[PDB]
Design a binder for this molecule. Sequence first.
Ligand code: HEM
Ligand code: HEM
Ligand code: HEM
Ligand code: HEM
Lengths: 144, 143, 140, 140
Amino acid sequence: MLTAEEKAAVTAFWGKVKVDEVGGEALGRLLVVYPWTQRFFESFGDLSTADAVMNNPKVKAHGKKVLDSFSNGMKHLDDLKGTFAALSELHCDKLHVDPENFKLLGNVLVVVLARNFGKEFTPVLQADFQKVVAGVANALAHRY
Amino acid sequence: LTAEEKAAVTAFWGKVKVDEVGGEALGRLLVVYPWTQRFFESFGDLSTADAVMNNPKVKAHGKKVLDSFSNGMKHLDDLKGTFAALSELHCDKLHVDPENFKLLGNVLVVVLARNFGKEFTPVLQADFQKVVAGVANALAHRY
Amino acid sequence: VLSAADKGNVKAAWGKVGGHAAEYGAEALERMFLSFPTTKTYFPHFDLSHGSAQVKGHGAKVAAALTKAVEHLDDLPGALSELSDLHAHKLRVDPVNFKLLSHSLLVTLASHLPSDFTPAVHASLDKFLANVSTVLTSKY
Amino acid sequence: VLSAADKGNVKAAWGKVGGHAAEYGAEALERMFLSFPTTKTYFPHFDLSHGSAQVKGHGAKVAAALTKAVEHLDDLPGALSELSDLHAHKLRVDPVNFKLLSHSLLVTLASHLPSDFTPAVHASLDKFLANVSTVLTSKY
Ligand code: HEM
Ligand code: HEM
Ligand code: HEM
Ligand code: HEM
């Protein structure tokens, strides 16, 4: 769990930053950096090159929904398990995603925040976001 | 585990030698995954495979580890509660990365296979994989 | 990147396996599918029930590839080139699954070769299977 | 093994890092220690406070090793032989921790080189750091 000071820091940062392209970038980078993850996204069409992945409209659209889910998590940090229970079932029982991949996407998201937000994404603030993405990954893995 | 699965693992576990299997599992962890030796500096000579496997402190510690597993086997509906104290020790005091809990569980499964052969069936092994995953998750909880 | 000692242990262990390699491959697959049911989703066209001729047949193929690896420990990338393309490019097998099969193979070997499966041999076989896994995922 | 394209990307990225390598090494260590506090237990002899001389100095050493790796991409095992023995045999570093430092390095590079840190470059640097990590844990 985050301390009060940490929760305040992540909340203030998340408030100010423009994040409507962050999810798409994170999913795209997941698919490029960890190519086995493409197995799960066959219906999204052309993922054959890095440029195809990053310019794929379905990748961008899906990434936005994924980050919307993360943003929902950020509003319920006291009960991530409850927040992600239904999504946990979907990812385990229906989609067959190994939970190691939840940690990978969380870490990619952190890299994307660093790339987009420069000096304000300090070592202290990043450490706070590492707690959040670990919390989300643990909640998504719970039903496994 | 289901009640019928719990019964199956309980009957099999009845057969396990408490004096030997734990020592073998810990010894194999230290040989196969040598970074784990970092946590056992005080145990003396771990410099070779034969030294590890014949080290009395490894055998003695392995017996305690298996005793803990045996305790887990009697509380399969509340592994979290059962392993709370050990979780504090391993996480807060020893700083063991939780990936290593999975490794030791899997080594134990290999040791059960080596010791019990055809009786350690694919079905029974699958049940024990659930148990050792449960134990690892319970030990990791304080992270 | 296996050491001389590891290569020695792997060749000797696989010699002891001998004509049982295909049987042990089938058992390892069965153990993987039962212990780790998610792995079944790579084989949607298979009957994966006990005694399936598809599991038997696939286990034989996996074992034959491991035999080829044991005979070419100095050049696993070349020997397994076709298999690397299949697993990484075509099938997009998640790297975690190689650890699950490798564990399943060690359980199987320990079961059948209890006198031969010493701590040192266990360590060598673990490294061997990790090396094979690394090659089959080398496109990643 | 790194592809020719990956090697190109790694050399170009490290060129852009240029004179900042030691600074970025120190920042990556700080990010590792703050994000993943278990890693601090390898450095009980350090003052781990922000800006400490030991963290700055160690960051410079890590950066120097990465520079040596970038200059010897065709033979990382030879170039990093001494470091492999240190990390695996003497220090017994848990392999998990290499992923934590590697992530910390990618966060640092993305932070400072946002225009240069493309998806393809990210992928190449990830593979580079994994390869360095594999060499330093090669005794395992
Ligand atoms: C923190 C991590 C993750 C979160 C929060 C998350 C969240 C979501 C959400 C919210 C959806 C449904 C979006 C909708 O309304 O349509 C979804 C679908 C999906 N997720 Fe995830 N996800 C995560 C990680 C992953 C990973 C790592 C993979 C695979 C490597 C994955 C694969 C999928 C797939 C395949 C779908 C269905 C896509 C389709 O409609 O065809 N997820 N995820
Ligand atoms: C399922 C996994 C594990 C179980 C059930 C287990 C169980 C135990 C138990 C019962 C003790 C005795 C504590 C006491 O007497 O108060 C102990 C101590 C210890 N365990 Fe584990 N353990 C596990 C995994 C690990 C792993 C993976 C490591 C290291 C890689 C580790 C390192 C230690 C150490 C260093 C001690 C203290 C030894 C000493 O100096 O006396 N354990 N463990
Ligand atoms: C030591 C590791 C492995 C070896 C040596 C191995 C070997 C093989 C071989 C020899 C084939 C048949 C090639 C052909 O007929 O063209 C094959 C196919 C296949 N392998 Fe593997 N494999 C390994 C790991 C895995 C893992 C971990 C998975 C998934 C969990 C997997 C899934 C498959 C699938 C789905 C096929 C195609 C089956 C079909 O549809 O006919 N393999 N493997
Ligand atoms: C890319 C990965 C890494 C590189 C390039 C690297 C590089 C180095 C270098 C150059 C040294 C100094 C060697 C000398 O003075 O002769 C060193 C020492 C050390 N490294 Fe690493 N390292 C890496 C990963 C790690 C990780 C993951 C850990 C632990 C979390 C770690 C812990 C240490 C420790 C404890 C020392 C000894 C410090 C001392 O003597 O004061 N290293 N490393």
